[PDB]
Design a protein around this nucleic acid. Structure first.
Lengths: 90, 67, 80, 197
RNA sequence: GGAGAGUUUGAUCCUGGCUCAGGAUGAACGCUGGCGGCGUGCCUAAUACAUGCAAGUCGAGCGAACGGACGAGAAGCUUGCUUCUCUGAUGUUAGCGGCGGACGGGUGAGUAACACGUGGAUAACCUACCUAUAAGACUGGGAUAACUUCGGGAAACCGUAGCUAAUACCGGAUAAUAUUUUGAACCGCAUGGUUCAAAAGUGAAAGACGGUCUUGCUGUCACUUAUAGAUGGAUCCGCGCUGCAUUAGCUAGUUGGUAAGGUAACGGCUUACCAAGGCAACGAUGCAUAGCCGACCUGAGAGGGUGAUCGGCCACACUGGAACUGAGACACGGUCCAGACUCCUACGGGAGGCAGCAGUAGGGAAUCUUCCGCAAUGGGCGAAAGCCUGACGGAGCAACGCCGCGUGAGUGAUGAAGGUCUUCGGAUCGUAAAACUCUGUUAUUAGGGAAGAACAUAUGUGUAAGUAACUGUGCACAUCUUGACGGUACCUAAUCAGAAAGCCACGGCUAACUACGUGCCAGCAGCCGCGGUAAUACGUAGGUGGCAAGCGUUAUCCGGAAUUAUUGGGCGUAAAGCGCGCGUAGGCGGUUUUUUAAGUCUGAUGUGAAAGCCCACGGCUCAACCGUGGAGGGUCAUUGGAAACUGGAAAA
């Protein structure tokens, strides 16, 4: 029931999604636990992103169903290569 | 009034389009003619009709633009 | 109005009948047990060990859940 | 109502040349009662008259003028200077203070048009805040109509914080100016007092 | 980063009140009106509501019906009609059963208190899904809806007699820290806690789809038991949190104990007994008012006021009560009951709950479309495709506000006409017009753009964990394929200065003057005050100032107000020292030395959500706006240091 996910923050037309960990019960645009990373689907194509990639693995190691739109970009950063490189390690 | 009380009002301006029993809107403002009034109606929003004998402060007394 | 929960109504009634039969069957077993405490034969161990099985045959499903079961065993496995 | 006025009668009131337009009847003051003696001046009239004397310069209005004034309220060094230079580091000014006109308004209809190209880019607003490390140009399509090179040719003037290429119609902003580099000089203290009360 | 001006009197200084200038609104009203960007929109009757949608999903768990592609035997010969037999792909949905309906959305009637904030605790608690791990996954049965058939029922719906299945349901077996009981060690904040040893105690779907195929083997998912993790929830605690003392006694399950019961757990939470305590001027109680907080407005600052939108917490769902299912509800679109209300009825009896989105009436000064769409993000089910999503994306109405552009620009005197005034010469509107010369932001037309917002999942390739076997599985690259908005925004060329400006005020406070009418009359007024035939204050004109697609008035809040004065006041006479005393509680306290470390100072660790404010930066053409990052903020907890001062202890 914990899912890293997206919280759009922009105004009308220029959205700026934020990556963030959360429990699915909550609203989207409301309460969270901790920010990590970010996203910007325009002002540069491909997008402009950051990532924690230090403690972002923490939340996966103890539970998450990270969604696909995220899963894509984590692949674009490739941190999941370390994730499975430990999980399907053993 | 709507709230069912009893008060007084001086109407301003030349001519008064009103009588017994007639609805009318209300503002506040005190005048020193006496007590027994501390309000005064507004001209032009409802039954109290705008008087077009003016051209200068037409924005008040209910007037609209002449041409 | 009503849309779909009518399913959960009927289900609620079925599980009503089932659950109360489980509980009240236990409660009568407990009545037997506590009433067997006065007695002197055994006549106790059969009944009390039986009921302490039934607590668990019926606790896994209903709302009790364990802590209170363990309190019932806590008092009742000692009085005999 | 940025500009639809005579704008001469104002300069007939205040005692300054521009704007506008052009340069007898200026010894007078406007109105029927105009020519005669009139009221004295309060302190309010002085700081106020100063205000309008900077306001009709750029043709602008007050709610914009204040907002300028208190974005000068952020930064360090003195205040009134920063209001002046930031008021004449605008797009109309960097046009006419470069010499591409005879008045300040010619630049405004020049730029609503979109004729100029801030960094080679169309812009329709005189309220842009020009900066250094830039060019400014003329939509090379249109660098030959009647008005412009009629105006470009004469060397009205040049400040040393502006460069210019009369062959290219290319200006480029250079140094942070001051009033001692900007003609039509003023007093600042009186006008800053006006926004106390 | 901070401004004063008027006003008591014949004239003066003071004390003292009142009014004005500024800023601000979820705002209305009058006048007026071009456009775009952004943001907002029942503050009143928690009043009643027609009509539409707002929560379903799984056939890859199950029985059962529809279906008819394809194959085919005879044919009434009409040689493709068809009778049956039918082979059965793909698909469907009535039903059972599993998970969700409790999240999400909406409002603020209640609530003066652990409700809220902040800091803590739990040797007094709970926790489905999701992760990780370990172990298991054996052996049996009996029913029942749909479906057939009967009856009562107007309808609502109910029952009768058979019949069928399952990851349904019920037994047994087996299973450890899980419960009782026994003993050794270890531990601490007190009740107690951690680990080890031994007697009794409970489970599971023989499941589904797939590969190899020996149908064995094993995979994905799924189930059960257990231990953790995290998440969500709960209770307790210190502190801060409104007004009246013309509210001073309240309370008896109250307060404490014993036992029992109860609950996830502690507990007068609740029963039976013993007891008379408990709370209160440091303001108990009772009373009226009210959701709170982050924050918003203002102010130089301390401070004052409010709790719209956005976000966190709480309570509520016609009023009121109770409980089942369930991990979680005492359940916002669930039940049961009683009540008011509306409605249907064959009069026996039944039905319903917009403070969900829209919308209607109603009140009110006043607050909009019965919109398109699931492309995106987030949800729910699933193996996935996919489906549902009035959340949400996003169009529409309102000058409601903020921001932005313009309603043309340069040359143009004659001081033209024409208005007004004239001390009748002339002055004034006035480069203003007319005219000349450019432009077309914007608009009219036509093209392109149909820009981005699109990342994707499913579909083929190769690659590593594990399997006897990528045969099949669990993973990173690659191509395929997705726009409601929207034929948008934006762009490109052409056309005409032609469509596009007003409001208030002019005695002073206050920038801004002259003529007419008027004559204590009509009238203005925020203050002081004008007005009785020559009004700069009334009404009209002209002109001027301010202001701008906005402007004036009204209501409310702060300022100015040093006019509750801690920063920052006063009491001889101006309002103001009780008639005076005795003394409690409290507040304040002479000197020196020694100590202590609560106060204090300092340093650190944690926390003070995010958004917001302020500073730096970058992008939307700039701005508004958005983001980033910074600083910032506690009467905050924890902890190491200093000792002069307040404080406590001791000696003089």
């Amino acid at each position: 029931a914990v899912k890293i996910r997206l919280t759009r923050l922009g105004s009308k037309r220029n959205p700026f999604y934020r990556i963030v960990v959360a429990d699915a019960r909550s609203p989207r645009d409301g309460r969270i636990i901790e920010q990590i990373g970010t996203y910007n689907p325009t002002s540069a194509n491909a997008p402009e992103i950051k990532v924690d990639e230090a403690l972002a693995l923490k939340w996966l190691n103890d539970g998450a169903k990270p969604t696909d739109t995220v899963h894509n970009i984590l692949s674009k950063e490739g941190i999941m290569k370390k994730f499975d490189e430990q999980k399907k390690a053993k | 009034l709507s709230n069912n009380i009893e008060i007084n009002a001086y109407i301003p301006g030349i001519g008064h389009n009103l009588q017994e029993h007639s609805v009318v809107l209300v503002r506040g403002g005190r005048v020193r003619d006496l007590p027994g009034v501390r309000y005064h109606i507004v001209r032009g929003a409802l039954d109290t009709s705008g008087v077009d004998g003016r051209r200068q402060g037409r924005s008040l007394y209910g007037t609209k633009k002449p041409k | 109005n009503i849309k779909s929960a009518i399913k959960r109504v009927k289900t609620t009634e079925k599980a009503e009948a089932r659950n109360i039969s489980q509980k009240s069957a236990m409660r009568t077993a407990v009545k037997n047990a506590k009433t067997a405490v006065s007695n002197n034969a055994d006549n106790k161990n059969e009944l009390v060990s039986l009921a302490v099985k039934l607590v668990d045959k019926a606790a896994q499903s209903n709302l009790i859940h364990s802590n209170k079961a363990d309190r019932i065993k806590s008092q009742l496995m000692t009085a005999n | 109502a940025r500009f639809r006025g005579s704008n001469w009668k104002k300069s007939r009131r205040l005692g300054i040349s521009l704007s506008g337009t052009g340069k007898e009847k200026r010894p007078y003051a406007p109105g029927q009662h105009g020519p005669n003696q009139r009221k004295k001046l309060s302190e309010y009239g002085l700081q106020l008259r100063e205000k309008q004397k900077l306001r009709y310069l750029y043709g602008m209005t007050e709610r914009q003028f204040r907002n300028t004034f208190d974005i000068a309220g952020k930064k360090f060094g003195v205040h009134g200077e920063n209001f002046m230079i930031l008021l004449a580091s605008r797009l109309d000014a960097v046009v006419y203070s470069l010499g591409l006109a005879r008045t300040r308004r010619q630049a405004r209809q020049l730029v609503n048009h979109g004729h100029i190209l801030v960094d080679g880019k169309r812009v329709d607003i005189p309220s842009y805040s020009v900066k250094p490390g830039q060019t400014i140009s003329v939509r090379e399509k249109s660098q030959k109509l009647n008005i412009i090179v009629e105006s470009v040719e004469i060397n009205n003037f040049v400040p040393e914080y502006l460069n210019f290429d009369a062959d290219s119609l290319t200006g480029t902003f250079v140094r942070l100016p001051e009033r001692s580099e900007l003609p039509a000089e003023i007093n600042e203290q009186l006008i800053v007092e006006y926004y106390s009360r």
